[PDB]
Amino acid sequence: MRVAVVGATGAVGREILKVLEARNFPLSELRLYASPRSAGVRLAFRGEEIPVEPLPEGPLPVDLVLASAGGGISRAKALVWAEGGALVVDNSSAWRYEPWVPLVVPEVNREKIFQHRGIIANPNCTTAILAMALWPLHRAFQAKRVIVATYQAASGAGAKAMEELLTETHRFLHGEAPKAEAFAHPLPFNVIPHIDAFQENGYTREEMKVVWETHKIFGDDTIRISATAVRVPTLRAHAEAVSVEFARPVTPEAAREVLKEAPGVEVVDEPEAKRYPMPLTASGKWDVEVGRIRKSLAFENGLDFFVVGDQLLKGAALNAVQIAEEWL
Amino acid sequence: MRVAVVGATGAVGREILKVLEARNFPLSELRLYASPRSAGVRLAFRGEEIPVEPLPEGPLPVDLVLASAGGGISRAKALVWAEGGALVVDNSSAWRYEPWVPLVVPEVNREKIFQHRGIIANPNCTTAILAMALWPLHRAFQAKRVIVATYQAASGAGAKAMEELLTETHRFLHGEAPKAEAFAHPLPFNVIPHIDAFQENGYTREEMKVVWETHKIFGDDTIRISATAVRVPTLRAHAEAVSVEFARPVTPEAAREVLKEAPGVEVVDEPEAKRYPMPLTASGKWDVEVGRIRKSLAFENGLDFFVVGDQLLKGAALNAVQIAEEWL
């Protein structure tokens, strides 16, 4: 199974090698691709060093293409590739909101993988994990209203921004005013209620995704979803205080056992033992932790939970994993 | 006109006297008090230093008393310092919920002042700054359902909890494991979905205050409230993302015009300009920043916004402002 990795040198692309390694993904070939910028650099796989070819304006030669190199190139290459007979999984937002491409999270609509006709859209970060937990609640209790507050990380802004936070928080401690460059403002010791592009209704493209992606990933345009994407001083883990109004009578004790069964969703819920989800323990694991399950006081039949999932893994883990299923 | 500070050395005692010294307070006596732990220290004030006294088991001698030395101590002397003839204004969770005690935020229930019997409670920092936004919106459209995902800083944990945050990040930035002592878990580069202590309902003592406290200051027992409280790696500014369902058709623009006219509350809401509240650009002001005001997609007639206010000031400031009115 010849596989290409368009985007290699990026945060996702780089994690894409290790999970791809860690799941013992059975390749045959090994192809890393980047735009000219990284035309001559080397990464590492199975301890063995592998080159990074710049992308050639001309489709060849692979079975599977795992794209994590912006929408510029993806919007531009998707078709060209799947035509060469390569299965295309893109982590960018170029084909997501398109009627012919399935937007999949293996815990939910794996069924859609085989409804593809050349490409498959990898979901947003904030959406993937939130689904990993919100998938089973929906199926069991039918939601109708979600209100999330995001505690997003630096990795979401790429690797250069993950680094910025290190160096910046560093100069901060030493007196010198943070040199904001990778974010809209200086992020050390602060929060930016601004993740993406502001639309006409007030929300940002990021916020708006929590909805359009859900409405499709679940195939239910009927769920009322509100969300505030906020950037915070954290390396690679996304946090999101969630709330929901249900059809069926919830029970923090019924959502628990149920949650206690869902795949890839470590339940982490113990107040007495100061035991709840945290980027402290979420970052690194393939799972998403979920805690603070409590009978919501806001809604007449609601729940307030907290969720954490590694942000670079809910890019790459669900990627290299959609393929593992393609196999199925 | 004599005043005393009980907890004259704590982070809050120190903002008190500086907004005392800054709002040119009509005092006439400068008695600073603190527990024996600190029975030998001197603070600043109008140029001269003042010695700090250990809390006397002999309540007296003053007219006004800005207490800020904990809960066990205010519970045991509020009544006494009171019988002496002093007016006790306490910034702690100890009297706030007693029937005969007025919980006051000048801008909302000033009149409640003149209906007290010795003690006037000073609400929860995550309520005061939150009340400055929700009040006008509430007495103009009428709240029915509030949901707030707090982003509280280490300032509210304390002085030793701010100082700790700095050295631990620094330590962390240097490749060594944070050694928490001031927080539940290591705070550097992380979020902690737990603030005070857990109640049986599944909610922490923190959240519930943001409710109970709101009911009493507002005079509306009926208002399905719901809080979520998380400590973020920030110095002394508190952020919250809100979503209040309102009865009267509300307007993002109509509500926005209310606020620019609401006291002690500055509006900051220009998306095209990357203009919204930020701990950074709000820590040290007497106004609370509101912005990101938008028509919420969660409910039919609702509003979502971002709120940022300085914790330590909405400790000291709301306290020496209650007294200013104890004069008027």
PDB file of all heavy atoms in Angstrom, chain A residues 145 147 151 194 203 207 224 228 276 279 292 294 296 298-299 304, chain B residues 145 147 150 185 190 193 203 207 227 276 279 292 294 297 299:
ATOM      1  N   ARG A 145     -29.537  20.932  21.578  1.00  0.00           N
ATOM      2  CA  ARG A 145     -28.913  22.213  21.896  1.00  0.00           C
ATOM      3  C   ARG A 145     -27.555  22.102  22.608  1.00  0.00           C
ATOM      4  O   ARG A 145     -27.500  21.673  23.755  1.00  0.00           O
ATOM      5  CB  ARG A 145     -29.891  23.017  22.765  1.00  0.00           C
ATOM      6  CG  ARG A 145     -29.953  24.497  22.457  1.00  0.00           C
ATOM      7  CD  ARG A 145     -31.379  25.014  22.531  1.00  0.00           C
ATOM      8  NE  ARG A 145     -31.906  25.049  23.892  1.00  0.00           N
ATOM      9  CZ  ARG A 145     -33.162  25.382  24.196  1.00  0.00           C
ATOM     10  NH1 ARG A 145     -34.026  25.704  23.235  1.00  0.00           N
ATOM     11  NH2 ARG A 145     -33.559  25.402  25.465  1.00  0.00           N
ATOM     12  N   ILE A 147     -23.909  24.132  23.790  1.00  0.00           N
ATOM     13  CA  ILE A 147     -23.266  25.415  24.041  1.00  0.00           C
ATOM     14  C   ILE A 147     -21.835  25.217  24.523  1.00  0.00           C
ATOM     15  O   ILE A 147     -21.603  25.066  25.722  1.00  0.00           O
ATOM     16  CB  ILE A 147     -24.054  26.184  25.112  1.00  0.00           C
ATOM     17  CG1 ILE A 147     -25.522  26.245  24.690  1.00  0.00           C
ATOM     18  CG2 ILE A 147     -23.475  27.581  25.302  1.00  0.00           C
ATOM     19  CD1 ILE A 147     -26.437  26.858  25.708  1.00  0.00           C
ATOM     20  N   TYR A 151     -11.237  26.083  25.031  1.00  0.00           N
ATOM     21  CA  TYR A 151      -9.997  26.454  25.715  1.00  0.00           C
ATOM     22  C   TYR A 151      -8.943  25.879  24.755  1.00  0.00           C
ATOM     23  O   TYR A 151      -8.274  24.899  25.066  1.00  0.00           O
ATOM     24  CB  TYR A 151      -9.900  25.748  27.087  1.00  0.00           C
ATOM     25  CG  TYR A 151     -10.963  26.149  28.109  1.00  0.00           C
ATOM     26  CD1 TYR A 151     -12.276  25.733  27.971  1.00  0.00           C
ATOM     27  CD2 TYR A 151     -10.655  26.994  29.172  1.00  0.00           C
ATOM     28  CE1 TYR A 151     -13.258  26.148  28.847  1.00  0.00           C
ATOM     29  CE2 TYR A 151     -11.635  27.418  30.056  1.00  0.00           C
ATOM     30  CZ  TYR A 151     -12.946  26.988  29.881  1.00  0.00           C
ATOM     31  OH  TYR A 151     -13.929  27.429  30.735  1.00  0.00           O
ATOM     32  N   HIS A 194     -10.603  34.922  20.191  1.00  0.00           N
ATOM     33  CA  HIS A 194     -10.555  35.043  18.758  1.00  0.00           C
ATOM     34  C   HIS A 194      -9.705  33.935  18.140  1.00  0.00           C
ATOM     35  O   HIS A 194      -8.487  33.950  18.235  1.00  0.00           O
ATOM     36  CB  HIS A 194      -9.984  36.427  18.425  1.00  0.00           C
ATOM     37  CG  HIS A 194      -9.934  36.740  16.961  1.00  0.00           C
ATOM     38  ND1 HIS A 194      -9.531  37.970  16.485  1.00  0.00           N
ATOM     39  CD2 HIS A 194     -10.195  35.981  15.870  1.00  0.00           C
ATOM     40  CE1 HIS A 194      -9.542  37.952  15.164  1.00  0.00           C
ATOM     41  NE2 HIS A 194      -9.942  36.758  14.766  1.00  0.00           N
ATOM     42  N   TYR A 203     -19.797  35.214  14.946  1.00  0.00           N
ATOM     43  CA  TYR A 203     -18.903  34.098  15.229  1.00  0.00           C
ATOM     44  C   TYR A 203     -17.681  34.108  14.310  1.00  0.00           C
ATOM     45  O   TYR A 203     -17.596  34.888  13.358  1.00  0.00           O
ATOM     46  CB  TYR A 203     -19.660  32.781  15.067  1.00  0.00           C
ATOM     47  CG  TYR A 203     -20.732  32.608  16.096  1.00  0.00           C
ATOM     48  CD1 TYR A 203     -21.978  33.231  15.953  1.00  0.00           C
ATOM     49  CD2 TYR A 203     -20.475  31.926  17.275  1.00  0.00           C
ATOM     50  CE1 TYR A 203     -22.931  33.182  16.967  1.00  0.00           C
ATOM     51  CE2 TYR A 203     -21.416  31.871  18.295  1.00  0.00           C
ATOM     52  CZ  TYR A 203     -22.636  32.500  18.138  1.00  0.00           C
ATOM     53  OH  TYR A 203     -23.538  32.468  19.171  1.00  0.00           O
ATOM     54  N   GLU A 207     -15.484  28.867  15.380  1.00  0.00           N
ATOM     55  CA  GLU A 207     -16.743  28.653  16.078  1.00  0.00           C
ATOM     56  C   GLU A 207     -17.760  28.001  15.150  1.00  0.00           C
ATOM     57  O   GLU A 207     -18.338  26.963  15.487  1.00  0.00           O
ATOM     58  CB  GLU A 207     -17.301  29.992  16.586  1.00  0.00           C
ATOM     59  CG  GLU A 207     -16.452  30.610  17.666  1.00  0.00           C
ATOM     60  CD  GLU A 207     -16.858  32.021  18.035  1.00  0.00           C
ATOM     61  OE1 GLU A 207     -16.756  32.921  17.181  1.00  0.00           O
ATOM     62  OE2 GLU A 207     -17.280  32.233  19.186  1.00  0.00           O
ATOM     63  N   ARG A 224     -29.186  22.692  17.624  1.00  0.00           N
ATOM     64  CA  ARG A 224     -28.837  24.104  17.873  1.00  0.00           C
ATOM     65  C   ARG A 224     -27.470  24.139  18.522  1.00  0.00           C
ATOM     66  O   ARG A 224     -27.317  23.665  19.637  1.00  0.00           O
ATOM     67  CB  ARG A 224     -29.826  24.769  18.840  1.00  0.00           C
ATOM     68  CG  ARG A 224     -31.260  24.802  18.359  1.00  0.00           C
ATOM     69  CD  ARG A 224     -31.434  25.781  17.213  1.00  0.00           C
ATOM     70  NE  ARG A 224     -31.628  27.143  17.698  1.00  0.00           N
ATOM     71  CZ  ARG A 224     -31.237  28.231  17.039  1.00  0.00           C
ATOM     72  NH1 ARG A 224     -30.598  28.111  15.876  1.00  0.00           N
ATOM     73  NH2 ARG A 224     -31.461  29.437  17.555  1.00  0.00           N
ATOM     74  N   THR A 228     -17.965  29.342  21.627  1.00  0.00           N
ATOM     75  CA  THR A 228     -17.030  30.461  21.724  1.00  0.00           C
ATOM     76  C   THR A 228     -15.631  29.880  21.705  1.00  0.00           C
ATOM     77  O   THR A 228     -15.207  29.289  22.689  1.00  0.00           O
ATOM     78  CB  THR A 228     -17.150  31.252  23.055  1.00  0.00           C
ATOM     79  OG1 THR A 228     -18.480  31.742  23.220  1.00  0.00           O
ATOM     80  CG2 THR A 228     -16.157  32.452  23.055  1.00  0.00           C
ATOM     81  N   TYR A 276     -10.459  14.714  37.025  1.00  0.00           N
ATOM     82  CA  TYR A 276     -11.174  15.193  35.841  1.00  0.00           C
ATOM     83  C   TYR A 276     -10.232  15.400  34.611  1.00  0.00           C
ATOM     84  O   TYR A 276      -9.003  15.326  34.722  1.00  0.00           O
ATOM     85  CB  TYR A 276     -11.882  16.498  36.223  1.00  0.00           C
ATOM     86  CG  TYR A 276     -11.117  17.265  37.285  1.00  0.00           C
ATOM     87  CD1 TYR A 276      -9.934  17.921  36.967  1.00  0.00           C
ATOM     88  CD2 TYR A 276     -11.487  17.207  38.637  1.00  0.00           C
ATOM     89  CE1 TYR A 276      -9.124  18.480  37.952  1.00  0.00           C
ATOM     90  CE2 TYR A 276     -10.673  17.769  39.640  1.00  0.00           C
ATOM     91  CZ  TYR A 276      -9.489  18.389  39.278  1.00  0.00           C
ATOM     92  OH  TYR A 276      -8.596  18.832  40.215  1.00  0.00           O
ATOM     93  N   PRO A 279      -5.518  19.025  29.959  1.00  0.00           N
ATOM     94  CA  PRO A 279      -4.497  18.916  28.916  1.00  0.00           C
ATOM     95  C   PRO A 279      -3.220  18.285  29.516  1.00  0.00           C
ATOM     96  O   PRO A 279      -2.347  17.777  28.814  1.00  0.00           O
ATOM     97  CB  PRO A 279      -4.305  20.375  28.459  1.00  0.00           C
ATOM     98  CG  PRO A 279      -4.767  21.192  29.617  1.00  0.00           C
ATOM     99  CD  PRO A 279      -5.956  20.417  30.139  1.00  0.00           C
ATOM    100  N   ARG A 292     -16.491  15.793  34.631  1.00  0.00           N
ATOM    101  CA  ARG A 292     -17.399  16.791  35.172  1.00  0.00           C
ATOM    102  C   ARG A 292     -18.841  16.603  34.744  1.00  0.00           C
ATOM    103  O   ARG A 292     -19.642  17.545  34.766  1.00  0.00           O
ATOM    104  CB  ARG A 292     -16.906  18.186  34.821  1.00  0.00           C
ATOM    105  CG  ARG A 292     -15.610  18.501  35.494  1.00  0.00           C
ATOM    106  CD  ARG A 292     -15.758  18.430  36.994  1.00  0.00           C
ATOM    107  NE  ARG A 292     -15.464  19.736  37.567  1.00  0.00           N
ATOM    108  CZ  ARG A 292     -16.301  20.761  37.555  1.00  0.00           C
ATOM    109  NH1 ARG A 292     -17.502  20.625  37.024  1.00  0.00           N
ATOM    110  NH2 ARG A 292     -15.909  21.943  38.015  1.00  0.00           N
ATOM    111  N   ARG A 294     -22.336  16.403  34.922  1.00  0.00           N
ATOM    112  CA  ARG A 294     -23.232  16.828  35.985  1.00  0.00           C
ATOM    113  C   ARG A 294     -24.594  17.228  35.464  1.00  0.00           C
ATOM    114  O   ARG A 294     -24.719  17.761  34.358  1.00  0.00           O
ATOM    115  CB  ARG A 294     -22.612  17.968  36.790  1.00  0.00           C
ATOM    116  CG  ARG A 294     -22.311  19.269  36.054  1.00  0.00           C
ATOM    117  CD  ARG A 294     -21.509  20.152  37.023  1.00  0.00           C
ATOM    118  NE  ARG A 294     -21.139  21.485  36.558  1.00  0.00           N
ATOM    119  CZ  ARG A 294     -20.369  21.740  35.507  1.00  0.00           C
ATOM    120  NH1 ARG A 294     -19.878  20.750  34.778  1.00  0.00           N
ATOM    121  NH2 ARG A 294     -20.072  23.001  35.207  1.00  0.00           N
ATOM    122  N   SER A 296     -27.190  19.236  34.432  1.00  0.00           N
ATOM    123  CA  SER A 296     -27.253  20.657  34.120  1.00  0.00           C
ATOM    124  C   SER A 296     -28.386  21.409  34.815  1.00  0.00           C
ATOM    125  O   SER A 296     -29.524  20.928  34.867  1.00  0.00           O
ATOM    126  CB  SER A 296     -27.410  20.851  32.613  1.00  0.00           C
ATOM    127  OG  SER A 296     -27.802  22.184  32.328  1.00  0.00           O
ATOM    128  N   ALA A 298     -28.966  24.693  33.916  1.00  0.00           N
ATOM    129  CA  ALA A 298     -29.427  25.616  32.878  1.00  0.00           C
ATOM    130  C   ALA A 298     -30.659  25.061  32.174  1.00  0.00           C
ATOM    131  O   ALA A 298     -31.719  25.674  32.188  1.00  0.00           O
ATOM    132  CB  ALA A 298     -28.313  25.869  31.861  1.00  0.00           C
ATOM    133  N   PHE A 299     -30.513  23.890  31.564  1.00  0.00           N
ATOM    134  CA  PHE A 299     -31.609  23.238  30.849  1.00  0.00           C
ATOM    135  C   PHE A 299     -32.470  22.371  31.768  1.00  0.00           C
ATOM    136  O   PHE A 299     -32.016  21.917  32.827  1.00  0.00           O
ATOM    137  CB  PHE A 299     -31.034  22.377  29.743  1.00  0.00           C
ATOM    138  CG  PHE A 299     -30.151  23.131  28.808  1.00  0.00           C
ATOM    139  CD1 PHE A 299     -28.968  22.561  28.328  1.00  0.00           C
ATOM    140  CD2 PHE A 299     -30.504  24.413  28.390  1.00  0.00           C
ATOM    141  CE1 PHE A 299     -28.150  23.255  27.445  1.00  0.00           C
ATOM    142  CE2 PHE A 299     -29.697  25.113  27.514  1.00  0.00           C
ATOM    143  CZ  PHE A 299     -28.510  24.529  27.038  1.00  0.00           C
ATOM    144  N   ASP A 304     -23.750  19.087  31.902  1.00  0.00           N
ATOM    145  CA  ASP A 304     -22.568  19.917  31.753  1.00  0.00           C
ATOM    146  C   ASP A 304     -21.326  19.038  31.888  1.00  0.00           C
ATOM    147  O   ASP A 304     -21.021  18.573  32.979  1.00  0.00           O
ATOM    148  CB  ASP A 304     -22.528  20.998  32.827  1.00  0.00           C
ATOM    149  CG  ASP A 304     -23.617  22.042  32.652  1.00  0.00           C
ATOM    150  OD1 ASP A 304     -24.795  21.676  32.830  1.00  0.00           O
ATOM    151  OD2 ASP A 304     -23.300  23.225  32.338  1.00  0.00           O
TER     152      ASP A 304
ATOM    153  N   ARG B 145     -31.919  32.410  31.290  1.00  0.00           N
ATOM    154  CA  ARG B 145     -30.999  31.285  31.245  1.00  0.00           C
ATOM    155  C   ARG B 145     -29.613  31.776  30.928  1.00  0.00           C
ATOM    156  O   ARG B 145     -29.375  32.268  29.841  1.00  0.00           O
ATOM    157  CB  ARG B 145     -31.429  30.318  30.162  1.00  0.00           C
ATOM    158  CG  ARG B 145     -32.692  29.594  30.497  1.00  0.00           C
ATOM    159  CD  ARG B 145     -32.357  28.183  30.911  1.00  0.00           C
ATOM    160  NE  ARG B 145     -32.014  27.399  29.743  1.00  0.00           N
ATOM    161  CZ  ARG B 145     -32.890  27.079  28.806  1.00  0.00           C
ATOM    162  NH1 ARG B 145     -34.144  27.479  28.932  1.00  0.00           N
ATOM    163  NH2 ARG B 145     -32.507  26.379  27.742  1.00  0.00           N
ATOM    164  N   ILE B 147     -25.421  30.784  30.971  1.00  0.00           N
ATOM    165  CA  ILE B 147     -24.483  29.677  30.933  1.00  0.00           C
ATOM    166  C   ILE B 147     -23.141  30.372  30.789  1.00  0.00           C
ATOM    167  O   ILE B 147     -22.932  31.137  29.825  1.00  0.00           O
ATOM    168  CB  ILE B 147     -24.720  28.779  29.720  1.00  0.00           C
ATOM    169  CG1 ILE B 147     -26.087  28.106  29.846  1.00  0.00           C
ATOM    170  CG2 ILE B 147     -23.592  27.751  29.602  1.00  0.00           C
ATOM    171  CD1 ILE B 147     -26.509  27.290  28.637  1.00  0.00           C
ATOM    172  N   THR B 150     -16.239  29.974  32.742  1.00  0.00           N
ATOM    173  CA  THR B 150     -15.205  30.815  33.322  1.00  0.00           C
ATOM    174  C   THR B 150     -13.787  30.383  32.913  1.00  0.00           C
ATOM    175  O   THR B 150     -13.539  29.212  32.630  1.00  0.00           O
ATOM    176  CB  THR B 150     -15.356  30.802  34.900  1.00  0.00           C
ATOM    177  OG1 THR B 150     -15.379  32.137  35.409  1.00  0.00           O
ATOM    178  CG2 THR B 150     -14.212  30.047  35.551  1.00  0.00           C
ATOM    179  N   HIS B 185      -3.692  20.970  40.776  1.00  0.00           N
ATOM    180  CA  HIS B 185      -2.708  20.282  39.938  1.00  0.00           C
ATOM    181  C   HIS B 185      -1.728  21.332  39.424  1.00  0.00           C
ATOM    182  O   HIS B 185      -1.843  22.505  39.772  1.00  0.00           O
ATOM    183  CB  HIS B 185      -3.426  19.610  38.759  1.00  0.00           C
ATOM    184  CG  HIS B 185      -4.457  18.606  39.176  1.00  0.00           C
ATOM    185  ND1 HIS B 185      -4.153  17.286  39.450  1.00  0.00           N
ATOM    186  CD2 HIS B 185      -5.782  18.747  39.430  1.00  0.00           C
ATOM    187  CE1 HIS B 185      -5.243  16.662  39.858  1.00  0.00           C
ATOM    188  NE2 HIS B 185      -6.246  17.526  39.855  1.00  0.00           N
ATOM    189  N   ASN B 190      -1.624  24.834  31.384  1.00  0.00           N
ATOM    190  CA  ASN B 190      -2.686  23.852  31.558  1.00  0.00           C
ATOM    191  C   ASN B 190      -3.983  24.476  32.085  1.00  0.00           C
ATOM    192  O   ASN B 190      -3.977  25.598  32.577  1.00  0.00           O
ATOM    193  CB  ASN B 190      -2.170  22.793  32.532  1.00  0.00           C
ATOM    194  CG  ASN B 190      -3.200  21.761  32.883  1.00  0.00           C
ATOM    195  OD1 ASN B 190      -3.661  21.017  32.026  1.00  0.00           O
ATOM    196  ND2 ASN B 190      -3.561  21.698  34.159  1.00  0.00           N
ATOM    197  N   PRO B 193     -10.232  22.163  35.518  1.00  0.00           N
ATOM    198  CA  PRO B 193     -11.692  22.164  35.618  1.00  0.00           C
ATOM    199  C   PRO B 193     -12.202  21.893  37.018  1.00  0.00           C
ATOM    200  O   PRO B 193     -13.066  21.050  37.223  1.00  0.00           O
ATOM    201  CB  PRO B 193     -12.086  21.066  34.652  1.00  0.00           C
ATOM    202  CG  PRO B 193     -11.049  20.065  34.894  1.00  0.00           C
ATOM    203  CD  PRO B 193      -9.784  20.903  34.898  1.00  0.00           C
ATOM    204  N   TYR B 203     -21.520  19.974  40.876  1.00  0.00           N
ATOM    205  CA  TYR B 203     -20.945  21.304  40.651  1.00  0.00           C
ATOM    206  C   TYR B 203     -20.020  21.716  41.783  1.00  0.00           C
ATOM    207  O   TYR B 203     -20.212  21.311  42.926  1.00  0.00           O
ATOM    208  CB  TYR B 203     -22.057  22.363  40.519  1.00  0.00           C
ATOM    209  CG  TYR B 203     -22.885  22.277  39.255  1.00  0.00           C
ATOM    210  CD1 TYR B 203     -23.868  21.291  39.112  1.00  0.00           C
ATOM    211  CD2 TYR B 203     -22.681  23.162  38.190  1.00  0.00           C
ATOM    212  CE1 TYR B 203     -24.631  21.175  37.942  1.00  0.00           C
ATOM    213  CE2 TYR B 203     -23.444  23.057  37.003  1.00  0.00           C
ATOM    214  CZ  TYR B 203     -24.413  22.051  36.895  1.00  0.00           C
ATOM    215  OH  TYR B 203     -25.135  21.881  35.737  1.00  0.00           O
ATOM    216  N   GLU B 207     -18.835  27.449  40.942  1.00  0.00           N
ATOM    217  CA  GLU B 207     -19.980  27.617  40.060  1.00  0.00           C
ATOM    218  C   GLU B 207     -21.185  28.132  40.853  1.00  0.00           C
ATOM    219  O   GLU B 207     -21.554  29.287  40.733  1.00  0.00           O
ATOM    220  CB  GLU B 207     -20.276  26.271  39.393  1.00  0.00           C
ATOM    221  CG  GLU B 207     -19.254  25.241  39.789  1.00  0.00           C
ATOM    222  CD  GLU B 207     -18.729  24.403  38.643  1.00  0.00           C
ATOM    223  OE1 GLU B 207     -19.482  23.565  38.112  1.00  0.00           O
ATOM    224  OE2 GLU B 207     -17.550  24.581  38.277  1.00  0.00           O
ATOM    225  N   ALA B 227     -23.040  27.566  35.848  1.00  0.00           N
ATOM    226  CA  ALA B 227     -21.628  27.930  35.733  1.00  0.00           C
ATOM    227  C   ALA B 227     -20.687  26.751  35.551  1.00  0.00           C
ATOM    228  O   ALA B 227     -21.000  25.614  35.872  1.00  0.00           O
ATOM    229  CB  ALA B 227     -21.176  28.757  36.959  1.00  0.00           C
ATOM    230  N   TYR B 276     -11.432  42.918  21.308  1.00  0.00           N
ATOM    231  CA  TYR B 276     -12.321  42.191  22.235  1.00  0.00           C
ATOM    232  C   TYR B 276     -11.561  42.132  23.561  1.00  0.00           C
ATOM    233  O   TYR B 276     -10.360  42.356  23.571  1.00  0.00           O
ATOM    234  CB  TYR B 276     -12.602  40.774  21.726  1.00  0.00           C
ATOM    235  CG  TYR B 276     -11.485  40.283  20.871  1.00  0.00           C
ATOM    236  CD1 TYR B 276     -10.233  40.018  21.419  1.00  0.00           C
ATOM    237  CD2 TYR B 276     -11.632  40.212  19.499  1.00  0.00           C
ATOM    238  CE1 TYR B 276      -9.162  39.713  20.622  1.00  0.00           C
ATOM    239  CE2 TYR B 276     -10.563  39.905  18.689  1.00  0.00           C
ATOM    240  CZ  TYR B 276      -9.332  39.663  19.255  1.00  0.00           C
ATOM    241  OH  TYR B 276      -8.269  39.412  18.440  1.00  0.00           O
ATOM    242  N   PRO B 279      -7.421  39.438  29.237  1.00  0.00           N
ATOM    243  CA  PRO B 279      -6.847  39.564  30.578  1.00  0.00           C
ATOM    244  C   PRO B 279      -5.758  40.621  30.539  1.00  0.00           C
ATOM    245  O   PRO B 279      -5.723  41.546  31.355  1.00  0.00           O
ATOM    246  CB  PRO B 279      -6.301  38.175  30.817  1.00  0.00           C
ATOM    247  CG  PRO B 279      -7.424  37.295  30.185  1.00  0.00           C
ATOM    248  CD  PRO B 279      -7.896  38.065  28.972  1.00  0.00           C
ATOM    249  N   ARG B 292     -17.464  40.851  21.791  1.00  0.00           N
ATOM    250  CA  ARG B 292     -17.785  39.605  21.115  1.00  0.00           C
ATOM    251  C   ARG B 292     -19.302  39.412  21.178  1.00  0.00           C
ATOM    252  O   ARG B 292     -19.801  38.289  21.057  1.00  0.00           O
ATOM    253  CB  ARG B 292     -17.060  38.426  21.774  1.00  0.00           C
ATOM    254  CG  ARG B 292     -15.627  38.273  21.327  1.00  0.00           C
ATOM    255  CD  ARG B 292     -15.538  38.126  19.815  1.00  0.00           C
ATOM    256  NE  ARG B 292     -15.499  36.726  19.390  1.00  0.00           N
ATOM    257  CZ  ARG B 292     -16.532  35.890  19.404  1.00  0.00           C
ATOM    258  NH1 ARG B 292     -17.717  36.290  19.821  1.00  0.00           N
ATOM    259  NH2 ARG B 292     -16.374  34.647  18.994  1.00  0.00           N
ATOM    260  N   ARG B 294     -22.825  38.943  20.207  1.00  0.00           N
ATOM    261  CA  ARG B 294     -23.389  38.421  18.986  1.00  0.00           C
ATOM    262  C   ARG B 294     -24.716  37.723  19.189  1.00  0.00           C
ATOM    263  O   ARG B 294     -25.068  37.345  20.306  1.00  0.00           O
ATOM    264  CB  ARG B 294     -22.373  37.458  18.350  1.00  0.00           C
ATOM    265  CG  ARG B 294     -21.767  36.446  19.339  1.00  0.00           C
ATOM    266  CD  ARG B 294     -20.693  35.579  18.689  1.00  0.00           C
ATOM    267  NE  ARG B 294     -20.371  34.363  19.457  1.00  0.00           N
ATOM    268  CZ  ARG B 294     -19.832  34.341  20.675  1.00  0.00           C
ATOM    269  NH1 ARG B 294     -19.542  35.469  21.301  1.00  0.00           N
ATOM    270  NH2 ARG B 294     -19.567  33.190  21.262  1.00  0.00           N
ATOM    271  N   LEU B 297     -26.633  31.399  18.287  1.00  0.00           N
ATOM    272  CA  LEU B 297     -27.264  30.392  17.449  1.00  0.00           C
ATOM    273  C   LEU B 297     -27.848  29.255  18.292  1.00  0.00           C
ATOM    274  O   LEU B 297     -28.609  28.419  17.797  1.00  0.00           O
ATOM    275  CB  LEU B 297     -26.247  29.835  16.445  1.00  0.00           C
ATOM    276  CG  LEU B 297     -25.956  30.561  15.121  1.00  0.00           C
ATOM    277  CD1 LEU B 297     -26.803  31.803  14.966  1.00  0.00           C
ATOM    278  CD2 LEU B 297     -24.491  30.891  15.063  1.00  0.00           C
ATOM    279  N   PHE B 299     -29.919  29.590  21.029  1.00  0.00           N
ATOM    280  CA  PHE B 299     -31.337  29.879  21.290  1.00  0.00           C
ATOM    281  C   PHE B 299     -32.005  30.829  20.288  1.00  0.00           C
ATOM    282  O   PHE B 299     -31.349  31.491  19.488  1.00  0.00           O
ATOM    283  CB  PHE B 299     -31.577  30.462  22.708  1.00  0.00           C
ATOM    284  CG  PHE B 299     -30.376  30.447  23.619  1.00  0.00           C
ATOM    285  CD1 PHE B 299     -29.180  31.051  23.246  1.00  0.00           C
ATOM    286  CD2 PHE B 299     -30.466  29.884  24.878  1.00  0.00           C
ATOM    287  CE1 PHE B 299     -28.102  31.097  24.112  1.00  0.00           C
ATOM    288  CE2 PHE B 299     -29.387  29.926  25.753  1.00  0.00           C
ATOM    289  CZ  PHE B 299     -28.203  30.538  25.363  1.00  0.00           C
TER     290      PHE B 299
END
